[PDB]
Amino acid sequence: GSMLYIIGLGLYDEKDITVRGLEAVKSCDLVFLEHYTAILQCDVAKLEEFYGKKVIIGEADQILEPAKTKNVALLVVGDVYGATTHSDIFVRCQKMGIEVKVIHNASIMNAIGCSGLQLYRFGQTVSVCFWSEHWRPSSYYPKIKINRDNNMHTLVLLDIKVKEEPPRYMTINQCIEQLLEVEKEQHLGVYDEDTMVVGMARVACADQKIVYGKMKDLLHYDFGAPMHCLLIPAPQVDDPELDQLEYFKYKP
Amino acid sequence: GSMLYIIGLGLYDEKDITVRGLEAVKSCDLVFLEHYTAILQCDVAKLEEFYGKKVIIGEADQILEPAKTKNVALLVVGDVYGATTHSDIFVRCQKMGIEVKVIHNASIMNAIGCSGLQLYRFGQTVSVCFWSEHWRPSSYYPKIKINRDNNMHTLVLLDIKVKEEPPRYMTINQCIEQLLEVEKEQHLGVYDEDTMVVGMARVACADQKIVYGKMKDLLHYDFGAPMHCLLIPAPQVDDPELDQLEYFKYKP
Secondary structure (H helix, E strand, O other), X not given: OOEEEEEEOEOOOHHHOEHHHHHHHHHOOEXXXXXXXXXXXXXXXXXXXXXXXXXXXXXXXXXXXXXXXXXXXXEEOEOHHHHOOOHHHHHHHHHHOOOEEEEOOOOHHHHHHHHOOOHHHEOOOEEEOOOEOOEOOOOHHHHHHHHHHOOOEEEEEEOEEOOOOOOEEOOHHHHHHHHHHHHHHHOOOOOOOOOEEXXXXXXXXXXXXXXXXXXXXXXXXXXXXXXXXXXXXXXXXOHHHHHHHHHHEOOO | OOEEEEEEOEOOOHHHOEHHHHHHHHHOOEEEEOHHHHHOOOOHHHHHHHHOOOOEXXXXXXXXXXXXXXXXXXXXXXXXXXXXXXXXXXXXXXXXXXOEEEEOOOOXXXXXXXXXXXXXXXXXXXXXXXXXXXXXXXXXXXXXXXHHHOOOEEEEEEOEEOOOOOOEEOOHHHHHHHXXXXXXXXXXXXXXXXXXXXXXXXXXXXXXXXXXXXXXXXXXXXXXXXXXXXXXXXXXXXXXXXXXXXXXXXXX
């Protein structure tokens, strides 16, 4: 019978899909890509003949209405839950009596392990947003304070805007700028200019870039194309963690 | 030239490897499985003709000495970093001048998202160990306190012993028992008998089992074969999170 397949594509290119994921794609009558998938390092035409199927790039009932009768696949960058954006889909499916099958893959949340920081030591994940006129939210700030006061690392996820018009990805540079301005305005002493942090670009991709250095140094560092994120280590870093970070130390 | 490939297999069966991962396996001269991989729901002979290669089941220089000259693959359950057990390998490789290539896959750390709990709200991850005579460690306990005092969820990873002789996996039952005994002995009021928690067995497998209920009720619940883990929600759970958990509510 009918089924909605939500399938994690991994983080880099078309080869990061699982065998299971490739099989569901191939069994499905319709295959949708979350637009966010344009960030993957493949092009759509090559992807289509890698699947042997036509793919649809995408509010939308165009995915769920067919799913009421046919096997439909939705393809998302990373991991279904790892992304956590896809929570409204589950609810909409429940509301409409559609069975959902999740196929898991790599997530930025585990992948950042390549920094050398221990993943068990990560506290809660925070999001930095694009500021706009009077809208200058800094809700993440007190949560970073909690992570640091309690000796946990922080993963800082950065914003992704679509609307005007091409998608604008927040950079590590703009992220550090905003964090420095919030500390200046709120002065709780959570981090500063000289705090050693980890800028990460294109995690789990071939041209992955990782730099460990001061906020003031990473502020002006060129990290290249998105996706970017930031790691703010706990105030104490284990020697084995420091030994790995040192490989990415900033110069000159 | 030579290369050590560390490849995440995913969480369920042979079909959870990525396409990239399958390609590296096939390009490698030698393929090793971490013994921990016996938990996967496939058998070795079927796996071998799925790869078209012979596989070696495994302290050990047998993996790295060849890697000094040949492309060698090490296969691990889940994600390389997601597991975090594999930190000593990286160091040993550094010591010996071996280039390492990580291939990412699903991890229990993202996969537990199927509970309905928001992954950004997870604090630090904790491990419960098998108690032995006078060795009764409870280091995880104060860390659970921090997560809960600061309104974060906890992932509780359970122990896996090998030595005497077949591998003994800790159950949710034995986990809850120990947690209840530690609270009785330490009485900081972190959780109790009536605290609603999430028992999870075989995450991301076809016979995945998820139960949401009281510690006293889950203590005697039969969860089946390993792997097991426990989720201890923050003291406040969002309505949308509660709506998902309710699907797994315990009866009768």
